[PDB]
RNA sequence: GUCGUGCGU
């Protein structure tokens with residue numbers, strides 16, 4: 001009775017967290033400020049992430065400055081790199097709420113749709129008396145303007161005549177409120193989306209009431225619980241795994257608390273997660289799986305679609321729900337999307353009466369949609385999503401409790417992101433990740449200097465040794481020669497027959513080999529003025545030529561549906577690659593080929609991988625974030641059979657890591673020279689250039 | 695100095 005009441009109180013407190021302080025602090029920031037910190041407060045306030053936290057208060061005190069710094073850096077990046085479409089609104093009556101002012105304005109529905117303004121968005125508002133209506137309006141004008149105020153879009157209500165009543169929450173003490181006179185035109189432009197930041201702040205505040213708060217603060221995973229070897233052998237036989245994976249699965253399931261599995265790429269980490277899920281289901285209980293990147297969630301959903309084996313070995317297919325939008329979610333698992341499942345479940349005076357009937361019908365449809373969504377969530381056993389999406393409003397409103405949580409690629413997410421899914425009464429958490437992989441995507445170098453980029457998995461590994469996996473079953477041994485010898489200094493043993501099972505017909509051809517490094521003799525990349533992202537068309541052309549040659553050689557012999565992937569460190573480079581591939585081939589690229597980034601492609605598996613090195617210009621003299629060993633390791637660990645690296649030898653040779661990689665490739669005679677039309681006998685210019693370079 | 699992200703009414 002009393003215990004249940006306390007548990008319910010804690011659950012509602014964790015789900016319902018006051019967001020007012022977050023806005024009160026963020027809204028005081030100056031949009032026009034050009035600095036690496038939100039304010040001019042002493043740097044001594046910020047502190048490095050402590051390995052051990054005495055109490056939740058200390059953890060919150062340490063994390064809050066880092067979270068604010070990360071939010072400020074993201075806001076600055078959106079201000080510079082992102083360029084939305086500014087709009088104008090008419091100021092209305094202002095309502096005074098707790099240390100805040102809510103302003104109601106009338107906006108055009110078409111303008112709102114074009115600008116993509118939602119109820120969880122942040123905007124910057126300015127007063128420009130000298131602005132010319134004919135003159136173009138952009139973020140540059142806001143940067144130049146000195147009167148800027150941050151506002152939060154609290155709600156968006158559509159009124160008659162296609163007019164939206166936008167409510168904007170701002171800080172009282174901000175001086176810009178003096179410009180918010182009634183019937184005044186204010187130019188507002190979107191900045192960024194605060195949903196992720198809001199969820200992170202809510203989790204940070206509610207960590208006090210989390211069941212595993214003590215373990216997180218102490219960073220001490222529950223001690224291993226000894227289990228009979230018979231169970232381990234039975235699990236290994238049923239799931240056709242190895243001894244290490246079976247032992248890790250048994251240890252993780254047997255003991256409550258935090259269980260960390262550290263497995264380099266290709267060591268069955270995803271297969272280990274699937275085995276854990278199957279074993280738990282065999283032994284109603286709902287399990288929540290969260291991955292930092294949507295690609296990992298899509299891969300997990302695709303793998304689960306094939307079925308899950310139990311201890312007896314029989315394969316069963318549980319109901320899996322993907323919490324996300326169709327656009328971000330992959331087309332292959334589009335059926336598993338929650339919205340698609342809900343759609344499948346159901347799918348004068350006279351004018352006033354007709355309007356009332358239409359409104360009643362719409363309300364009934366909304367109620368039916370809510371009921372179908374609730375039924376799908378309740379019946380479903382596996383809920384796969386992302387860390388940011390794990391705190392979806394629907395899940396919080398439903399109130400269902402997830403006693404088992406899995407965090408895939410825990411090293412790719414910050415502590416707050418990894419802890420977000422634990423708000424739902426998480427008593428058992430299993431984190432799978434390899435520290436050598438890419439770190440969490442942090443836009444602030446200062447925050448990383450304070451160990452903000454450090455993930456909870458890394459800290460837990462430092463405190464105690466996780467369950468280690470040293471056997472791989474994906475990467476070709478030749479491909480894994482260099483990554484294992486350099487990054488891991490060994491400790492990674494290839495499978496008994498990886499080479500035999502990785503043999504492919506195109507490997508026989510000299511141009512195409514399991515491992516090959518192609519050099520761009522003549523290649524330069526242009527940095528975008530706004531996004532500050534490099535991009536070179538030479539690598540795109542070379543990749544297109546390689547793909548066309550591979551298809552022509554083995555068009556009908558072997559189908560390449562979902563077997564060729566191209567990873568580029570730069571978003572702009574990936575977008576250009578996809579656009580040019582669509583222009584050249586057409587719709588086949590939608591299925592036969594995939595395009596992604598190294599961080600966005602982390603965890604993905606493809607038979608053929610093309611790693612595009614954007615930094616193809618020697619005059620730059622800098623390789624960029626690629627210099628880090630984790631980036632190269634993740635990029636190289638994507639190929640299962642064939643890996644092709646495109647780049648400029650001179651530019652990459654400057655960095656020690658790429659220099660060593662090129663030397664290793666030369667030792668194995670895997671180095672190659674490529675250019676425009678280097679595989680075209682007609683294009684004798686390419687042959688002449690190759691001969692001259694040699 | 696540039697790599698990610700949350701929603702569908």
Ligand SMILES: Nc1ncnc2c1ncn2[C@@H]1O[C@H](COP(=O)(O)OP(=O)(O)O)[C@@H](O)[C@H]1O
Pocket residue numbers: 240241242264265266267268269270271472473474602603604605
């Ligand atoms: N015991 C095994 N027998 C055969 N194949 C295995 C075994 N364990 C793992 N594999 C293969 O190795 C691959 C492991 O990939 P994984 O390491 O999960 O990728 P990522 O590191 O991106 O998560 C799987 O695709 C699976 O087919």
Ligand code: BEF
Pocket residue numbers: 263264265266269409434437602603604634637
């Ligand atoms: F360790 Be794998 F690259 F997800």
Ligand SMILES: [Mg+2]
Pocket residue numbers: 268269270271408603
């Ligand atoms: Mg995995």
